[PDB]
Design a protein around this nucleic acid. Structure first.
Ligand code: MG
Ligand code: ZN
Lengths: 49, 50, 51, 455, 1341
DNA sequence: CTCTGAATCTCTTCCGACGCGCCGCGA
RNA sequence: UCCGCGGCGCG
DNA sequence: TCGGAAGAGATTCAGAG
């Protein structure tokens, strides 16, 4: 998974309970940046939350 | 005063344009009312059969 | 998702005679319910019907 | 789904999700024993959410999405011109249809429209599959499809075979009155323009400055029997709004007939006697007499007797060569006097009407087609054209306008002396200008309308 | 005198009126407004500096720290314009702002700074207008339409009793700010005064008046006029102005000077007023009934008890009067109610008000504005104050201030953008005066009242939105944390700014997609004015009155060019000379009148001033002294035409054509035809398509030169010189010695846009029109563009036209065309289509571009390379593969019995399927370009690597050729400097060029020049190498593309399209026509010399449409080619050039008093020969719009041409060989092809896809859907008895998911059965109604 | 002098053609 | 294989 | 996660008691 978001903020691993899958997200000041990236079958894909 | 064969001056032409745009707007608006009225009449009279 | 707005267990399978779990795949079991899940072996048309 | 793996969610799904979320929240606040005002707020939000789900925008501010647009609730799916009732239950889109730019075709009979070959192939592709397998040229649907997509000329022969009696419907949006949809028996032409018969084009309210038209093919045999018996243009001669015929010529046809029947005081071969209209046609075509020349001709006419027989009469009458030529096409039973005058549009209208009342439908149809052909041909031979010298300006006009402006100056100076109120001054000026304009119009009509020539 | 270039094809003008002012640069509004937006400004008046200063600085109180703004600068755009268009990235430059952060000490004074930090913030990216006035957004051209909206200020308006319908008249005055809440004041059928805020509610006006810090008695004293009464015992006195008596009926005797005189029951008249005024009466004695019925003006106090018995707005109770008179307050104050002049309206409002005090009114206003919450004094006060008087929440811009003052007649012109108490009370007083009838309501449709807002204002508004969002973020950051250990670079987030600006340029209703059919269309679309958009108007709510022409449109907005249909009136075009005043009001030029002599000075006017003065009509004849010939010169003034003496005239129109836009101005003989047809022709002219080969129009209007040069398509000579080199694509010009700057190479190069997709799929091509060694002049046109020839607009083509009905093939506007036209490719056009292939890293395996396609013949693949891309230059046809792409299908598991069934079947049921791009059905053409874009980290295939190699080679050769040309220029300048003296020409000639540059011929300034150019050479080689390195990295670098796509491929397909029956063609006067027949050339009518006609038009349309002018055009055409024919023959016989020279001089002299006055005696004979060569194809004629050729001049030209004077000729019918008895009008006409080709519309669907929800067939040509059997057609069927076809239309053909299958089966089987099921849309409706909670169900199953 | 009904006033809701064609954009 | 929203465009 | 017409409700005026 992509290790840093487009701003260069560091990324953490989260569970999407609405779709039962792992995703990666970034935070700044502990708050969510509103960015996420998801696994879509061998191709991590990224955008706004 | 001038007919179409002779040239119309700019003033005559300009004042004449009033009627032209009046008529074009007139038909543009009239179409909608006519269609609406027809839809109504059809809806009222659609049951009637000999 | 189960119990979701598109939960196949309720509305039926997304595909003709195809169990969400993949238990059954053809009409030989047409009109039966999968044990691992409550989806039914039926046609996709039921998706249009069930409320 | 969308490009990039995204998904467009229907707004109904979002409203449902919001209501589900509020219900879950209320149930959680209830089951964990929340304070009173909190659960009251949650249930009021839930009620508002249900209101949004059913009829968002019905009360207060409407809910909106990221696009700053109000979301379409269930009620919006049935209300309005985009609603389900008007859009789909009525006014369905339909298979087996095409649209094309229309075009004049004068060589068509009344009941046949010119239909581009490509559209015919596409529309009747199922029928072609059927007949091609029936005649044994193709065995399977795949074979039929690959054969028709290669346009093996045998497919063209089959296509010419299939449509021979197969009426199609032509429609022009908007379909203001029922004439707007009519049935025709197709004829195959290369190109891409649908060709109409001008006479029915007049009824369509259509023109040829780029109007498109849509064509539908009936499927079942009861349907095509209906199209033939009810809708075929040979039946819709009489408008429903009034008894007068709707199939009436205009433009070049009327101009041609008018030219053909107009006489002049002196022309090539005036006064000779023709033993029959055929000799009139000969003398015109051989160029020894002009159409306008007045002549005596022997003519036979007929009348529907008291029993119903077409009793004949023959006599010498004074007429014009053009009038005899036109008479030659007239079917038996109409009196010659109908023709022997300068034929305008209204005269032709009443002529068609009297033909339809005196005789049956089919003689009237044939009469209409012959009228169209002859009118076009003689209009073309006429060579009528408009030139700058034609719009003569009556030389009286300058004098009349000078008189009018003199009177305008007189009334204006009369007001300058304070003898009248301004409103009546305006009225007087308007009246005198109107009088002068009418005088000029009369002078122009008088100068244009008649002219002097040697006898 | 004419430039040498213009000596080619000197068009013959016919205008008699001189021209005193050249047409301005046509695009000036767009370019100048954008420049005003972006350019630097020290005063901070407009643009970036104004926007920043309107928000900055930013201060934090608890933080005790400040953010402040130094300056802004705009960075370099990294990509050129054509690179942006190729790669699809918005043409933008980085916004750089210099920012400072300040921290003070924690001790007084707060202004004691302690630390300063400064840095430059990359706060956003901003689009740049291209030189042609269009923006580049993503990969698209977009041009922002300048809006026209209601100006801020105050207006006064009345309805003719329509609302209440009893016959009275109601009035309202409205105040509109630039931004913020809108107030309007209104009367009532009960004559009460009401105020409303953003049209929320309706409230008595006193609410605001006491909300403003004024008490009731102050309100009465301010609004009304007061009269004084005295009581002594029971005798009553009043203090009077005699004029105050006027209006009343003297029902009682009235005393003056100790004598009483009144004719009782009679109204006081002017004789009475004069009698009292000469009496000089001051105080009179009146009966009790007279003071009865008078309002109590103020509170009154009784001192014997300390009690009040009089209130505000109360009637005179005689009991109270006695009580106050006995108390001692013998003086009484009352208002006056003239039934006409002094309506008691404010008093009635004061009676009906619910509020009693300032805070009561404040809380009532608050609860009105903020329903559903408890009022509070602070909340109401803050709401009111911030609403009207917070200069950031509400602002009348300076234009608002100007209009506000000038409508209120106040002397001031400037003021604070916020309202005030005096402003409100003044506007209310003005409304009262209007209600009295001593004034007039305002006319908003008037053009001195609406304002043009260009792109700059909208851009700065969006940028201000960005600035305020950033300001909120910055103040939040200041509040939340420390101030020392951070840099404002992080504090400012560029995201809101870029979001706002990109949203504006992409989304906004006024950012409409550009059209590029032809240069005229691009010009008129750039110049177009729209009344819609943000703060504008809606097509549904637009009444007639805004659409209709307003008499101040003259000279400012062209009345003709408006679009047809529902948009009419709401869209307009600038008149040719109109330019924007700095306040956004339209402005028109005029010529100063000075005592009967036109000064030829130019003054610019706005609708107000123009209405104030008297302006003379353009066509007024003048002497050479400037005196009009006629004394009673016709003029217009105050919106009316009349006659005036020579001295009364104040101004004169500049030129005849100033009433029309360019689009109308192109039409010749406009003065001879109706307005409807002229409008349609003007609009249609935009749709013309550029032909394969351009042609001049014979009967032009002179405007073609200005339009062709001003548009961006043509390459114009920016620097004079001599053309050194030309090929199909490059132009190299040697600048002359004097024009070149010191240190420059003296050579300029131009590269032509050879072929590219236009924004409407037409071709765009530039063709050179010069030859080696020809001199070129500043502003000359070197290379033609689409529909341009020799720098003149070339939309259409010249056709030979006869007006004659022909066998019905021209029935009802139909056009019949001779095959000769087709054979010469006269109207053949070139079209480009662009197709995109997207390769994705989809789930269940990636999808790849490849030539390994399953289930396909190898012959098709041979057209492709092994990579899976078609070679350029290959012909391709409908249904063929252009690029091969393949999608995996997932597992596709087969049971072993199905495995063996597949095995006996063959290779079917593959887990891998074709997805390759295919030619659109019916399209065929040739493949001209192929492009690939791919994500980083992926390998470049054979096609990708080969195209990258060719592109880098192209870049290298281009840069090196530029080097060679410019270094040749530099060394030519070396030669030019060295030959000047101290020459060593042969001694240098033995030496190589490097020696020339190195060696010193002298020791003087010449050697300084040589050293300068040598350093220039070093600098240019270094910049060349840097440029090539950047270019190579820029080519080799990958692309971002989109999510999920690995690589995209775009292929370019070009097709040649041909005139065909069903195509639509039209002439400039607006006579559309569908071509309905092609004819073998033999069959067309032919004239006496045997040359056939080309196009046959129906004459019947002319009198009924009243397009008389077009007939005149035809005649001129027959004249024009006439001369051409003669001169052609005179050339073909190869006679002495002097004879044709004198003939040409005669042809130019032929006009009477024409301004042209061109003479050939100054032309050398080879120039005359070149002129003849261009004139061989006819002599182009120039006819201005309203001063055009007269019939006498047309006749004279024809007579010199040896054609029939009437313009009609005898004609023979080719099909029979006989002669038409009537003469026929045959001439030359200019015709266009209208981009509605038949093959783009013909469409048919037997069966295909079906929609998801409704199961109905798809809609539209692209989806290959079917037509819509609309409800009108259903009623049509119902009118017949045709039930069965209706049932078939609804159920089986459309919606029955099984019935149509059965029908297809039976039709294939040859049995025309039918089985109607149930329309699935009905089940959809049932399910939705049930889901609504309403139970609905069928019965009697 | 008070009460009820009718009339008038205020507020809210509904409507304001059919058909095709391209372009853009889509938290 | 697709719900549109905005925009021009022709009837 | 914009004006117009019609209907319903509220308020005011006149007549009768
Ligand atoms: Mg039409
Ligand atoms: Zn299961």
């Amino acid at each position: 998974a992509p290790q840093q978001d487009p701003e260069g903020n560091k990324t953490m691993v989260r569970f999407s309970r609405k779709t039962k899958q792992q995703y990666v997200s970034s935070e700044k000041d502990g708050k969510a940046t509103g960015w996420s990236a998801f696994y879509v079958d061998g191709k991590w894909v990224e955008g706004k939350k | 005063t001038a007919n179409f064969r002779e040239g119309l001056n700019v003033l005559q032409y300009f004042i004449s344009t009033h009627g032209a745009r009046k008529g074009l707007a007139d038909t543009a608006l009239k179409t909608a009312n006519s269609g609406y009225l027809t839809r109504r009449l059809v809806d009222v009279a659609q049951d009637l059969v000999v | 998702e189960r119990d979701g707005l598109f939960c196949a267990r309720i509305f039926g399978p997304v595909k003709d005679y195809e169990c969400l779990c993949g238990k059954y795949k053809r009409l030989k079991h047409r009109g039966v319910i999968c044990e691992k899940c409550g989806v039914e072996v039926t046609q996709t048309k039921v998706r249009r019907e069930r409320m | 789904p969308l490009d990039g793996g995204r998904f467009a969610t229907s707004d109904l799904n979002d409203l449902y999700r919001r209501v589900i979320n509020r219900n879950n929240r209320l149930k959680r606040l209830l089951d964990l024993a929340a304070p009173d005002i909190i659960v009251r707020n949650e249930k009021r939000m839930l009620q508002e959410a249900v209101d949004a789900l059913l009829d968002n925008g019905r009360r207060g501010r409407a809910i909106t999405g990221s696009n700053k647009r109000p979301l379409k609730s269930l009620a919006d799916m049935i209300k309005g011109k985009q609603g389900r009732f008007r859009q789909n239950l009525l006014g369905k889109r339909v298979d087996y249809s095409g649209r094309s730019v229309i075009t004049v075709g004068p060589y068509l009979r009344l009941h046949q429209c010119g239909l581009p070959k490509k559209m015919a192939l596409e529309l009747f592709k199922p029928f072609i599959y059927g007949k091609l397998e029936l005649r044994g040229l193709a065995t399977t649907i795949k074979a039929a499809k690959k054969m028709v997509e290669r346009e093996e000329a045998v497919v063209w022969d089959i296509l010419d075979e299939v449509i021979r009696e197969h009426p199609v419907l032509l429609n022009r949006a908007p379909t203001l009155h029922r004439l707007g949809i009519q049935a025709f028996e197709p004829v195959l032409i290369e190109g891409k323009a649908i060709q109409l018969h001008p006479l029915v084009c007049a009824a369509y309210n259509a023109d040829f400055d780029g109007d498109q038209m849509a064509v539908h093919v009936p499927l079942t045999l009861e349907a095509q029997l209906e199209a033939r018996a009810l809708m075929m243009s040979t039946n819709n001669i009489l408008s429903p709004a009034n008894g007068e015929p709707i199939i009436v010529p205009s433009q070049d046809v009327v101009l041609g007939l008018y030219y053909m029947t107009r006489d002049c005081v002196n022309a090539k071969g005036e006064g000779m006697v023709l033993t029959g209209p055929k000799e009139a046609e000969r003398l015109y075509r051989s160029g020894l007499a002009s159409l306008h020349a007045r002549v005596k001709v022997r003519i036979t006419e007929y009348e529907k007797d008291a029993n119903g027989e077409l009793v004949a009469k023959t006599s010498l009458k004074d007429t014009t060569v053009g009038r005899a030529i036109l008479w030659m096409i007239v079917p038996k039973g109409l009196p010659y006097s109908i023709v022997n005058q300068a034929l305008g549009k209204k005269a032709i209208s009443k002529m068609l009407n009297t033909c339809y009342r005196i005789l049956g439908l089919k003689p009237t149809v044939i009469f209409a087609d012959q009228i169209m052909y002859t009118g076009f041909a003689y209009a073309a031979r006429s060579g009528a054209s408009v030139g700058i010298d034609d719009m003569v300006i009556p030389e009286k006009k300058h004098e009349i306008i000078s008189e009018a402006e003199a009177e305008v100056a007189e009334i204006q100076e009369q007001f300058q002396s304070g003898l009248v109120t301004a409103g009546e001054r305006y009225n007087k000026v308007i009246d005198i200008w109107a009088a002068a304009n009418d005088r000029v119009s009369k002078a122009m009509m008088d100068n244009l309308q008649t002219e002097t020539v040697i006898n | 005198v004419y430039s040498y270039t213009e000596k080619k094809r000197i068009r013959k003008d016919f205008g008699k009126r001189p021209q005193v002012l050249d047409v301005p640069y046509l695009l000036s509004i767009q370019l100048d407004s954008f420049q005003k937006f972006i350019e630097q400004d020290p005063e901070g008046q407009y643009g970036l500096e104004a926007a920043f200063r309107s928000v900055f600085p930013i201060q934090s109180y608890s933080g005790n720290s400040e953010l402040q703004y130094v300056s802004y600068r705009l960075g370099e755009p990294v990509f050129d314009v054509q690179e942006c268009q190729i790669r699809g990235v918005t043409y933008s430059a980085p916004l750089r702002v210099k920012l400072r952060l300040v921290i003070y000490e924690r001790e007084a004074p707060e202004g004691t700074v302690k630390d300063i930090k400064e840095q430059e913030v990359y706060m956003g990216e901003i689009p740049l207008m291209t030189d042609n006035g269009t923006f580049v957004i993503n990969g698209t051209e977009r041009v922002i339409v300048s809006q026209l909206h209601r100006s801020p200020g105050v207006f006064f308006d009345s309805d003719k009793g329509k609302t209440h319908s009893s016959g009275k008249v109601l009035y309202n005055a409205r105040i509109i700010p630039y931004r913020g809440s809108w107030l309007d004041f209104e009367f009532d059928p009960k004559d009460n005064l009401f105020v409303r805020i953003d049209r929320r509610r309706k409230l008595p006006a006193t609410i605001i008046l006491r909300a403003l810090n004024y008490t009731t008695e102050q309100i009465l004293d301010l609004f009304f006029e007061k009269v004084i009464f005295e009581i002594r015992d029971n005798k009553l006195q009043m203090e009077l102005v005699p004029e105050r008596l006027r209006g009343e009926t003297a029902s009682f005797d009235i005393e003056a000077n100790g004598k009483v005189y009144v004719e009782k029951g009679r109204r006081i008249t002017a004789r009475h007023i004069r009698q009292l005024e000469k009496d000089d009466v001051k105080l009179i004695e009146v009966p009790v009934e007279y003071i009865a019925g008078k309002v109590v003006a103020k509170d009154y106090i009784d001192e014997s008890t300390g009690e009040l018995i009089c209130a505000a707005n109360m009637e005179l109770s005689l009991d109270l009067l006695a009580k106050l008179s006995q108390s001692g307050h013998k003086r009484i104050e009352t208002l006056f109610t003239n039934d006409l002049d002094h309506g008691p309206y404010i008093s009635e409002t004061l009676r009906v008000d619910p509020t009693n005090d300032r805070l009561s009114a404040l809380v009532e206003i608050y609860r009105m504005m903020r329903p559903g919450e408890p009022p509070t004094r602070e909340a109401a006060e803050s709401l009111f104050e911030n609403l009207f008087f917070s200069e950031d929440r509400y602002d009348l811009s300076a234009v608002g201030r100007m209009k506000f003052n000038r409508s209120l007649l106040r002397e001031e012109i400037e003021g604070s953008g916020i309202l005030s108490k005096d402003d409100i009370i003044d506007v209310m007083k003005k409304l009262i005066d209007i209600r009295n009838g001593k004034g007039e309501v305002d006319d908003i449709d008037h053009l001195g009242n609406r304002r043009i807002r260009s792109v700059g204002e909208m851009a700065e508004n969006q940028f201000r939105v960005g600035l305020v969002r950033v300001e909120r973020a910055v103040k939040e950051r200041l509040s939340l944390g420390d101030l020392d250990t951070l840099m404002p670079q992080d504090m400012i987030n560029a995201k809101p700014i870029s979001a706002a600006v990109k949203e504006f340029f992409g989304s906004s209703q006024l950012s409409q997609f550009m059209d590029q059919n032809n240069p005229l269309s691009e010009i008129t679309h750039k110049r177009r004015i729209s009344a819609l958009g943000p703060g504008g108007l809606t097509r549904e709510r637009a009444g007639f009155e805004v659409r209709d022409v307003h008499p101040t449109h003259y000279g400012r907005v062209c009345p003709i060019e408006t679009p047809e249909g529902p948009n009419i009136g709401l869209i307009n075009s600038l008149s040719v000379y109109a330019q924007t005043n700095e306040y956004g009001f339209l402005e028109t030029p005029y010529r100063k009148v000075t005592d009967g002599v036109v000064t030829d000075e130019i003054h610019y006017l706005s609708a107000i001033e123009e209405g104030n003065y008297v302006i003379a009509q353009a066509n007024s004849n003048l002497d050479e002294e400037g005196h009009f010939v006629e004394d009673l010169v016709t003029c217009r003034s105050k919106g009316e035409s009349s006659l005036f003496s020579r001295d009364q005239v104040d101004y004169m129109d500049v030129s005849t054509q100033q009433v029309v836009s360019v689009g109308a101005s192109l039409i010749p003989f406009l003065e001879h035809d109706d307005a409807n047809r002229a409008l349609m022709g003007a609009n249609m002219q935009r749709q013309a398509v550029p032909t394969l080969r351009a042609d001049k129009p014979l009967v032009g209007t002179g405007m073609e030169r200005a339009v062709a040069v001003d548009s961006g398509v043509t390459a114009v000579a920016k620097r004079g010189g001599v053309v050194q080199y030309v090929d199909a694509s490059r132009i190299v010009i040697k600048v002359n010695e004097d024009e070149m700057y010191p240190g420059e190479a003296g050579i300029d190069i131009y590269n032509l846009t050879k072929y590219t997709r236009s924004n409407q799929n037409t071709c765009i091509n530039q063709m050179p029109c010069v030859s080696l060694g020809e001199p070129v002049e500043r502003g000359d046109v070197l290379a033609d563009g689409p529909s341009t020839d020799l720098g003149e607009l070339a939309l259409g083509q010249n056709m030979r036209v006869a007006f004659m009905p022909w066998n019905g093939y021209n029935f009802e506007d139909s056009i019949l065309v001779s095959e000769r036209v087709v054979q010469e490719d006269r109207f053949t056009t070139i079209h480009i289509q662009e197709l995109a292939c997207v390769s994705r890293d989809t789930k269940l395996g990636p999808e790849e571009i490849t030539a390994d396609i399953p289930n396909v013949g190898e012959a098709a693949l041979s057209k492709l390379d092994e990579s899976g891309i078609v070679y350029i230059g290959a012909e391709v046809t409908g249904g063929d593969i252009l690029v091969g792409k393949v999608t995996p299908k997932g597992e596709t598991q087969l049971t072993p019995e199905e495995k063996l069934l597949r095995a006996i079947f063959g290779e079917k049921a593959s887990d891998v399927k074709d997805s390759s791009l295919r030619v659109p059905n019916g399209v065929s053409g040739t493949v001209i370009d192929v492009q690939v874009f791919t994500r980083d980290g992926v390998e470049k295939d054979k096609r990708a690597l080969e195209i990258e190699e060719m592109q880098l080679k192209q870049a290298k050769k281009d840069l090196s050729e530029e080097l060679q040309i410019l270094e040749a220029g530099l060394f030519s300048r070396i030669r030019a400097v060295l030959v000047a003296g101290g020459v060593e020409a042969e001694k240098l000639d033995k030496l190589p060029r490097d020696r020339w540059l190195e060696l010193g011929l002298t020791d003087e300034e010449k050697q300084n020049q040589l050293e300068q150019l040598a350093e220039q050479y070093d600098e240019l080689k270094h910049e060349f190498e840097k440029k090539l390195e950047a270019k190579r990295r820029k080519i080799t670098q990958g692309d971002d593309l989109a999510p999920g796509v690995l690589k995209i491929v775009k292929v370019y397909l070009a097709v040649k399209r041909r005139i065909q029956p069903g195509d639509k063609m039209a002439g400039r006067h607006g006579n559309k026509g569908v071509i309905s027949k092609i004819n073998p050339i033999e069959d067309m009518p032919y004239d006496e010399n045997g040359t056939p006609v080309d196009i046959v038009l129906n004459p019947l349309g002319v009198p009924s449409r009243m397009n008389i002018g077009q007939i005149l055009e035809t005649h001129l055409g027959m004249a024009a080619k006439g001369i051409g024919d003669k001169i052609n023959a005179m050339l073909k016989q190869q006679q002495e050039v002097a004879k044709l020279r004198e003939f040409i001089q005669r042809a130019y002299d032929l006009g009477a008093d024409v301004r042209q006055k061109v003479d050939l005696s100054t032309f050398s004979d080879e120039e005359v020969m070149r002129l003849a060569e261009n004139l061989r194809k006819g002599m182009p004629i120039a006819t201005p719009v309203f001063d055009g050729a007269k019939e006498a001049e047309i006749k004279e030209l024809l007579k010199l041409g040896d054609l029939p004077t009437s313009g009609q000729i005898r004609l023979y019918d080719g099909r029979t060989g006989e002669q038409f008895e009537r003469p026929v009008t045959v001439g030359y006409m200019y015709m266009l092809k209208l981009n509605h080709l038949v093959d783009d519309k013909m469409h048919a669907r037997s069966t295909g896809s079906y929609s998801l929800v409704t199961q109905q067939p798809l809609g539209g040509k692209a989806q290959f859907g079917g037509q819509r059997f609309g409800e009108m057609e259903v009623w049509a069927l119902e009118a017949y008895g045709a039930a069965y076809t209706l049932q078939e239309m609804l159920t089986v053909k459309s919606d029955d998911v099984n019935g149509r299958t059965k029908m297809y089966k039976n039709i294939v089987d040859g049995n025309h059965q039918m089985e109607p099921g149930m329309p699935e849309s009905f089940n959809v409706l049932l399910k939705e109604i049930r889901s609504l909670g309403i139970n609905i169900e069928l019965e009697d199953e």
